[model samples]
Target: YTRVVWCAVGPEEQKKCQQWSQQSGQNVTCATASTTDDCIVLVLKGEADALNLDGGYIYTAGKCGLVPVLAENRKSSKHSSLDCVLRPTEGYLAVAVVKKANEGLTWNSLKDKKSCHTAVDRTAGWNIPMGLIVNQTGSCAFDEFFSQSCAPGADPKSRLCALCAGDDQGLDKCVPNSKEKYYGYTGAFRCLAEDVGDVAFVKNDTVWENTNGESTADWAKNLKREDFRLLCLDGTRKPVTEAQSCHLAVAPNHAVVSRSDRAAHVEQVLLHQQALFGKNGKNCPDKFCLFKSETKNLLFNDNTECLAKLGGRPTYEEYLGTEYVTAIANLKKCSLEACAF
Candidate 1:
């Protein structure tokens, strides 16, 4: 009945949200927070309407009573004739990548190795990778599993933060913001590319996008796709192209979430909003806001094609699937302190 208040998780998102609010004729508005957890809490407190959340973040929000509304559908590697808004979501592949020249280093050899991660509490970056590690190793001391890591959001004083080099100013090390040099997908891949880490926990697409001239950045420009391999579950390594079989897990797609009482309205409003600003929108050339980010993944995944409606009204557990839910549950046992917060 009223405007939908979107929760912006950081300052960059807040800036984007500001423009969105002005352009939407106030059909949308903004509520800002320092982190995803903070934004979810805002929604829980009724200060915000919805957020575009990662699978890991969805687990957190879902447990807090938020319901998933719609999924972010991206371009399919396998061509589908379905309209983007009607297409079913294919989750991203979470993988453990190592340089091909790091001969004999397989899944069996990962212990005490230096590592790179996108950030704490993210899907491919943290949950899927860490969850599999904890479940297989039967140890909750994941922090000690690696000799050093650039896992953002860990304490700056911990070994987990030891490998993280902050921004150009040598500040904000281990921070979750984009400024952290070893932060997100690009940052974590950059870590592995630059030889700062033995392995990187990221999606399969990350490897292709950063290699073989897919990326224009200086650090990734010379990287070749053939130089990297994925760590398969069988303790063997395979080419990045085989990620569908080698991945740690197939993560759930990112989706919009809102309180159950507001879920229907949020979905409706978002559907209408996307038509005015979506990839194929008539006004997209000028008054745009549906999913493009100047920075990486602001309100939605940059690769999102559309916010596809869910086939069934799914509960959080249903949306995440039973196995992944169980995996997250098992893994959360080790991250109890962090999850508790």
Candidate 2:
């Protein structure tokens, strides 16, 4: 197929996909689904070509035989003069964020507390944080670890989804899609910001982007960075800026994946597509900015600088990082049932 069909995981993403479809002169097409799992199935069934995914989703997709195509690279804090597309990813920080008013709370004191996760199988949202907690508590019952939470992919009736609020109509609560009010990075952080949950599991960029007028979304509009603190493993709290040193894990950057058959074509189309709408692409803003999100990071993270090509053909294990793969494997060891989608 000359056209790439993208799978959008929720209504917002579906709309964005349509926009990208129109702008691409039909070089791209859209196939929308409610959950990331469903979208993965679409690509697996050859109904769609590819989509950018987090490390945890990558794990699931990789297990099903999809291959990594490109990685999402953001502007680096380090003084690097290298072009974004050629730059190797340094990965992003995964941190637990809590309101500073919860003075007695620390990483050590997280038991039975209300929590917010970006989604069930995301790097920062669920895998890394839950994996660490499972290791520390030495118990497989992560559901019992939190008194209440807004983990979007759990059973809708379970306590894991207790804190989730659905769309404006109050429908589809706890779904692993953006329609759920407490899904994804912005939603999980908003869950914490609105005091719906005690702690939010997200990345450093999530904290930085939504606080102190950095985000104009109604829930995040007036948030002050000082009101939030990062929970460190050492049982101490630090400013968001300290994420460089204080974090649970350094996660692999989110990347695009497609069936091995379509890998090269997907990469070529994306390389050319991003050139028109990427951060510094020739037709960006004037035509369409692919990386700039209206908010909620539809398709790609708003912070994305470009989709960087991998150094070589790396398998999923190599793409996600060996240590991280082991960490996720260790977490799955806690359960006897299949953890993949």
Candidate 3:
């Protein structure tokens, strides 16, 4: 189940759906629309297919790329129930877990066409072994950052299956820290607490750009926390402090300054700040992506504050690694008085 703030607008859309599912002993939740907007309830739920949620978060959450494809939504007119395609693409072959009702829904007709009674007849349940990814863009951009990016678009075969067990989706799973190691495209971590278990990636929000032209689904967020934690993803999360050396906060050449001050420059100093939320920025540790409106502080240039938000800098070295720091240390060694410029 996805965790988002609660509100009223979300309850309105899924009012009927939730009531319907409850009667069947299978309770399901619908997602809210927007969580960060001024009204904050126009966004739709993007993770509904991944995990069902109460109809609360939908109204308050922004769009997340989560869609649902019911097995019976398509040609269920015949005796054989039809299976729905999870991730569909034009040229790629798709898979559907046929239901006993699917036999009657075939694209072609058979002589003495007996109404079929079962589906995918082989597996206990109709499951696409391949992973299903709902992207924000029109197209899929698979990357190694996830549990293992699901195949782009669709898998030739219907299976969306992958190896998932312990936290073994890393080097530990294959080599166990031995001299021999080969990082393959699989993880051992099983989704926990939630029915889907743990996702290799974890992101609470989705980032969008060109909504109209993009071919991806409506929204996207990391499947799980591991999917976002620095161990599997980039950046870090911990209480920040001055001991952490941040990157330069200079604006690039020709950078456009904000109109508030109309004079200073804005840097990408808020690098990982987009992931954080709220004024206290309590949970933030990565650099911020700030746009200040202050009238003082020339360093602020166009009126921006230093990247000093609470979750300002990453303090967890285990995941971030001191390597970036090591580069600075080596520079000092060579820049001493005895050394040449």
Best by TM-score: 2
lDDT by residue (tens digit), candidate 3, 184-241 = 1111111211223122221111101111222122222222222221110112221111
What are the RMSDs of all candidates, in order?
2.4, 1.6, 26.2
lDDT for each candidate structure: 0.86, 0.91, 0.20
Off by over 4 Å in 2: 336-341
lDDT of 2 by residue, 218-316 (tens): 888899999999999998999888998899999999999999999999999999999888887787888788887756899999999889989867999
Worst 10 residues of 3 by lDDT: 116-125
lDDT of 1 at 289: 56
Summed backbone clashes in each candidate are 0, 0, 69
Q: What ranking emerges by lDDT with the best candidate at the front? A: 2, 1, 3
Candidate with more favorable, higher TM-score: 1 or 2: 2
> Following a full C-alpha superposition, what root-mean-square deviation does model 2 have from the true structure?
1.6
TM-score of 1: 0.92
lDDT per residue (tens digit) for residues 84-150 in model 1: 8788889989899999999999888899999999989888888888887887788899999999999
**Is candidate 1 or 3 superior in lDDT?**
1
User: Any residue pairs clashing in model 1, and if so which?
Assistant: none
